[PDB]
Amino acid sequence: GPMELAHREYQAGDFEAAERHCMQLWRQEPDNTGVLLLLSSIHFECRRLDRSAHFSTLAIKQNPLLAEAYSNLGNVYKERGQLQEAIEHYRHALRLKPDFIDGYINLAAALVAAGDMEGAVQAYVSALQYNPDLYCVRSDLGNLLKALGRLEEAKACYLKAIETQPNFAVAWSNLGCVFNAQGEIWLAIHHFEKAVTLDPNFLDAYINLGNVLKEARIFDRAVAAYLRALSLSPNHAVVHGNLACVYYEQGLIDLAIDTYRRAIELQPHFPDAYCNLANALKEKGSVAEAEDCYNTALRLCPTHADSLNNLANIKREQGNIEEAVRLYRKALEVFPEFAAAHSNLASVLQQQGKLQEALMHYKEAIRISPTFADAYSNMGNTLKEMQDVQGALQCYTRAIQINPAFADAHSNLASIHKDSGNIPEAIASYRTALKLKPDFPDAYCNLAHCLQIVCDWTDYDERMKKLVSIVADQLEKNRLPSVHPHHSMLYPLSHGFRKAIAERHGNLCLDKINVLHKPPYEHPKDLKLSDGRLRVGYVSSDFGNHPTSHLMQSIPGMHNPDKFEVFCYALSPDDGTNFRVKVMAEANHFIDLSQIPCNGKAADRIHQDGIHILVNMNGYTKGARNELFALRPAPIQAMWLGYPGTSGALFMDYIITDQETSPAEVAEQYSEKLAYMPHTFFIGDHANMFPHLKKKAVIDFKSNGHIYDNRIVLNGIDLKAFLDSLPDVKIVKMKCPDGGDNADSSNTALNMPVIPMNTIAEAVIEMINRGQIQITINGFSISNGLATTQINNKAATGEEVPRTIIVTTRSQYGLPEDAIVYCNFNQLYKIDPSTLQMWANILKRVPNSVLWLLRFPAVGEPNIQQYAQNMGLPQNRIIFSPVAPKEEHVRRGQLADVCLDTPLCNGHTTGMDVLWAGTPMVTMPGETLASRVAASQLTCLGCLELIAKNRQEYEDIAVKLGTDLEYLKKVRGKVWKQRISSPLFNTKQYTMELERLYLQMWEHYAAGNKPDHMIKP
Amino acid sequence: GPMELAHREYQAGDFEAAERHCMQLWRQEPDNTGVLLLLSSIHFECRRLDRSAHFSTLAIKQNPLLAEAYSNLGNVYKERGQLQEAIEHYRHALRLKPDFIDGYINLAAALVAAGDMEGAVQAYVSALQYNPDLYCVRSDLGNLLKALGRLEEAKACYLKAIETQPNFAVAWSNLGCVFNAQGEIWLAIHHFEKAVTLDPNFLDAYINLGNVLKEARIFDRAVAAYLRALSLSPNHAVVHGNLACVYYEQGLIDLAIDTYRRAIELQPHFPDAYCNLANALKEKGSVAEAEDCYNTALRLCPTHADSLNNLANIKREQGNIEEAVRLYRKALEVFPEFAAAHSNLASVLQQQGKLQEALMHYKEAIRISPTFADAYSNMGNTLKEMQDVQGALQCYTRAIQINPAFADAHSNLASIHKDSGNIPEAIASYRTALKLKPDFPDAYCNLAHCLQIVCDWTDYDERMKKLVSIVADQLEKNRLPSVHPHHSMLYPLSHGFRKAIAERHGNLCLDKINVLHKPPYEHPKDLKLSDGRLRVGYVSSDFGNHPTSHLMQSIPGMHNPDKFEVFCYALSPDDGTNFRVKVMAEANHFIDLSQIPCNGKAADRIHQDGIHILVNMNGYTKGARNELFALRPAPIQAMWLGYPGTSGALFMDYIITDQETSPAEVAEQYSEKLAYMPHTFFIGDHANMFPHLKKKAVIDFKSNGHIYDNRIVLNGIDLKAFLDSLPDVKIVKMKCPDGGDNADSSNTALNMPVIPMNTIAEAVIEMINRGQIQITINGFSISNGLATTQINNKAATGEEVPRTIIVTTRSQYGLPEDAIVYCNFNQLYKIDPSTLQMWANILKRVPNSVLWLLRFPAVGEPNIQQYAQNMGLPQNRIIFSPVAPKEEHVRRGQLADVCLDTPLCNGHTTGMDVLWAGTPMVTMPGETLASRVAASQLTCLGCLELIAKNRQEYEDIAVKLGTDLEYLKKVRGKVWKQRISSPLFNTKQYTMELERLYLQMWEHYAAGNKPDHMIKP
């Protein structure tokens, strides 16, 4: 009867005896249908919930005042859906029994199943308010509040639970999840380790420990945590992805490959492993599978951004630009924050040329991710390409400030330094990069050139041999050489190599021009409508104040308009030089192009101009645009008066030279043809701008009786107008080797004016000795060369003729008055150790000898000083002046005795300067056109003995001259005597022969014949 | 006057205005000398503590009631030493001013400077009791209590401090130290990271974080923590050691080398880095520096144990045993817990031979460190050497249970399995090791032999070729071959290889014997005092129940005592065999040696015995001690009646053979000489132990008229005594090829007794058919061969002659009555695929043919079954019986038709069995002595046609016999006819010729001549 062994069968889990005995109870004592609801609890477990409703109906019918029937009613109703009604009678419950426990619990279970979190929380908190011991209900507020987001209020529920039942191993792992959210890992992995020590058959702790151990980049322990995690469940398919990532990061690639296969096997629909597997393959070589795998990944989802980026990159290694373009577009528009896509897109845009939008991509990429040095470097490349921002230099610097492990970035900023004039910084940076990058050739090449600028010849021949190997090797790799085409003529290389580099750069230029597919010009054969007058075109980024201009400036002045019409084309923007003033002054057609960035319309403009002959000044130099010639608009395009070494363009037509400078033997290394001058291709210009030095004057020396022209002299546009003012001075007929013929002229320029001790002359001597600015006697402003720029800079800038009378002194530069002056003025870098041995020998073999140099740049003086005594010379036998502007630059040479040449590559213009000054010059031909230049001027002067054939000959000639002072005197003589009679200055004749040669060229072309070596005009 | 801007100058830190103004105060208001004690505070900072005492004297004199004077007095006194007096007036202080603060603090400073911790603690706690705000005093109780050791009471002082002033960055790092002590690292590295985030110019936190990060075996983060630690202090010399250890553990050896150099540079006296640097070098090759560095280390301290161990190891690679011995002794006695030294010492003891003490070293090494698998493996080697503990097998198992990555350990336990009879386990283990160790040759060799036991011929020729390569390669490495000398004659190898392996093992044996330096014996030339009688010695670990004994047992029975005296030497302990009973029964001198483990006294005993001729039975087999012969005590030592293949000992003297088995052609591969028998060297023994089978009897077959001897037969010691009891049975003269001569004898053994249907004979037939135990008629116990062991095991063990009458039936083993029976009984492993093809061919070419085998072992039946039908045979054409003891083993052969030989290596004894049984035998000579054996018996029988010369001949002979049933009948005839007349059994004659040959040998030796091939005796 009344007995709970039926409830004990419930304790066992059966009903048979319980149900029969409770059936007996109903048939004897129908008051406990609640036991039938316990039977209904069996029914909940055994789905006989219909009979649960039956028993509940009985209970409520007999006993309408027991909540528990409604409780079971709610359970079955939640199974059957009416959850709001379940709440209806649950809240109808808990009224008659306010202290009922399980009602609150499963009520909250109901509401949370309905989405009404807030009510559920109050339900639990009420339950706790009644009972503080439910050590497994607290953890459920944990699971709830932490889901709501009120983290810091959660972490106070777990902790009560833990301290209540300290073996509880589910209130440690959850608490681990909270600390993992707030960001403090070093506690999160602690709490997890406690919660597997307490219960080593628990799976969630093992995973979560794996995850937070592969964020903190511990790896070995992460592997162990996973391995146990799956030996509790061996087919998890999500462990199998992470485990691969860890294997891939340790460096054990093959295990990653295998495990990824296992993961995709276990679960097929899985884009991430596809993408990541693709990366795993791509780094192992089998790229074909990589592309296919990326295809599969975006098949399962066309929006998975990572695959888009990576596949686009893969295509971009095959130049398939637009595919990658649109794909990067897609990824960026899906994910508007993905910095890597920004970088990749911008770089391919750099390939596209358009860059300002690429610039803003670089900007925004940094904006989202402020720690991406690579983008800084690349955007610096962009800026340097589009302008010359030194803030871009700062951008490089920022990259180093983020990571100083970039050899390439250092190389960049060093390039800016070299361009600017910051030589030491560039040196330091290149050494930095090389010490970080042993293998980098380009840094080696630029560093080599910089060292050659600074005369530091440590390991000299070693450097040349290594870099010769590098250029040969690089050229075989079918890439553009590191060595700049201009820099070549410093290093000793084969003719084949120098040519090959020239064509490398030339074909590079035509490679840019080709892709534009601009229509060809049908220009040629226009000599009839031309009405017998030809058209000549010159281009120059150096119309203005530049040595090239200083050399060709007067050529348009006497061009024949009858059969020729001249067209000027200034590439550079104007700078208001008097040079340029003259340029458009006598120009038949002056045309500016600084307003024309378009290669097209410029070339087209040439096409309408229909210029028969087109001539270049620039070639490969700083600041030129040769592609304008690469399109070959005009029928004939030629090199002239530029750096030697043919471009190898194959569309250039005619070099300019003479019979001897470029003989036919070396015609194998010049891509294009030859044109021969009667005397030389290098035309003088000084007499036009400085005819004032046509006559001179010299003061008396400290000693008398002997002649000393080259210590202190007098010059001035009105020096002759000053001679008559002199009361009585000596005028000796200075003689070259004469013998008595042709010296019996008026000899105004052939008689040296030697002023002996004269009262006015002596006086002005003392007022000049003290460094006084200038004095004026007899209406003539008496001046020194040193302060002519202060008197009027324009007089010395060459553009303006000087007016005053000029005096110069050896000791004005501290020069002793009785030392044999050997000198030169070429830029410093064109000197090597070997030639330095040559000056060493000659200077040693003369006691009262001095070598004159320039500190241009000044940073090389210590280094040359070192080797000066290393081969045993004092630090007083060599004297080096500072840089002086053009007029006094050429004037101060007149004080010197004998200049000497640099055999590595001659001074193109400077040798002309000293020759015009009347000082002698001596050289030995090399083997390159540049090297061969120097003898050309002498041959035009017809002084063959001043040319050597071997290095020993050079030394012997220098010794023979330096010893033979008398012959030196008459050498300065005959140089002076020829310079007035030389054909080097008949610019009338030069233009004459030049135009005549053009007409011969054009008449040969009128036959349509191929260009050929037009020897013997 | 009264003004504290003097105290403000103190705030600045100067005294000038303060001291002058307070001097003015004293001269106007002499009441504040305490300001002069503030001046004295400057004095403490500026060592003017004498004037501090002066000012204190003034203050106490005027004001004897201010503690502060005593406070300054205590400070200076602590400087001056009287610290107990400092406490004296400090405790004298704090009386008038009980609430003074700084007194408590510096009081505790005083006491802790005196070693009285306890009082100091109360001092601080009192201070706190007054003021709860001293956020920088709590941390000092921390520093104190944690030093006392009351950790868990410390951690409650820090925590109050931290929450008081949460920026305090010295109460985080210390608290980190506490958690590091209690053992919970994952909190320790947390608290440190908080305490560098709060203060990044703090050094102790950076080190301590480094240390606890290289215990938890994080490495990269440890490197970073150190690198910053020294960029705050760049010459620390203790960081520089740990940093090396971390570099060495990452695998970046060279950085470790460099940093160790840097550490020893910074600080010279530093043994640990020396020792550790030595390890760093030793693993890089430069061992010479390693020894020197260890020398330096123990120079700075002769007690540094680690260096002792490592240096001793280094020496032990140079065999310098005693040096390492004493050194390990030193290290162990310094450090009585160092398990590694225990292991090393024990292993070198294993080299020393003495092992029981090495055993206890292994025990104690495990005892201290219960997780050292290596020692388990080694001690297992020891135990297996000294006894055969299978608990040692368990020791191996324990090693795997610690780490199953030991291929070598698996190989060991597999060796035990193979020795025991646990073949499958050995197979599994060897495969396990090989799959873990691709490179291991020895496992390959043993695994190969095991496979050959189990007939699994997968990849057969591939295995032989690979292992042939391995043995050649191993032999060139000047090491003992993996292949056991006995196992060789299974694999096909060159004569050179087999010889070479024999000498490898032989020289190995003499290598053990050599080191003992036992004095040589002056035995030889003793034939005069011998009085004309020679002495012969036999050794055998197989006197007893063993085939060798079963073969030579009766030889001592007829040895001539006149000129020879025999000496027996049983190596093995007695087992009470009737064999052994006979052995000492007719022995001239039976000598036991199981009581003699000493090689010495045994060899000496032989020396006093002065035995002229010494003969071996064992050779390289299981259970032998050949070194006893390696010492060559007796003048002459010979191989005889053992496994073929000369030992290559070079101290063996004479093999035994005949003219034909071992012709002179192959004498190149036998180290020692030859001795020729008139007929053969292999002597029969059966007639002595089984003369009962001299006569037989056969029952009638199912069919009549034709003769069928080989289906059901009768035997028994009294079968002839039973023949007369028969009323009337047929006695047909069974004929070999006779022709009518010599067959006209009494023919008792030449007439086959064929019992036709006879009432008593038929009756006993039925009472045997049902498997009845046995029946008895006419006083004769009628028995079947199958139950003879149950009747009396002794009768079948060979030792005892059977008594009853024996019957046997073909179907008694299920054999069909009319199938051609081809058979053999050799051990299973002496079969290959190729010969199996041979039986395949012959068995195919006869319809009613059956092949009889044995399942010995039974594990090979499935594998042979596979290949049986693989070459296409049914599973009923081959029948295999179980193992049967000796008597019925040889008896059941009589039912068979024709036995067949295994050409790989013949059955030494079994062929003799079947020959004695009268069944025919056929073979083809191989090329090794073992192979050549089989034809020897036939040649002694003079039946040459039963010998083949090629494999095809073998098949053709088998076909010709199997087809020719009549000739088969007369073949069984002539085998039976010869076996009674054969010289194979005249043991009288065998001993005769044997002794005569000894005497010839000894008479040749009496001349002192070198041993030579004594052909033609």
Residue numbers in the entry:
A (entry chain A), B (entry chain B): 23 to 1039
What do the authors of the reporting publication say about this deposited model?
A single pair of enzymes, the O-GlcNAc transferase (OGT) and O-GlcNAcase (OGA), catalyzes the addition and removal of O-GlcNAc on over 3,000 proteins in the human proteome. OGT contains an N-terminal tetratricopeptide repeat (TPR) domain required for substrate recognition and a C-terminal glycosyltransferase family B domain (GTD) that catalyzes the modification of protein substrates with uridine diphosphate GlcNAc (UDP-GlcNAc) as the sugar donor. Here, we present the cryo-electron microscopy (cryo-EM) structures of human OGT and the OGT-OGA complex. Conversely, OGT disrupts the functional dimerization of OGA and occludes its active site, resulting in the blocking of access by other substrates. This mutual inhibition between OGT and OGA may limit the futile O-GlcNAcylation cycles and help to maintain O-GlcNAc homeostasis.
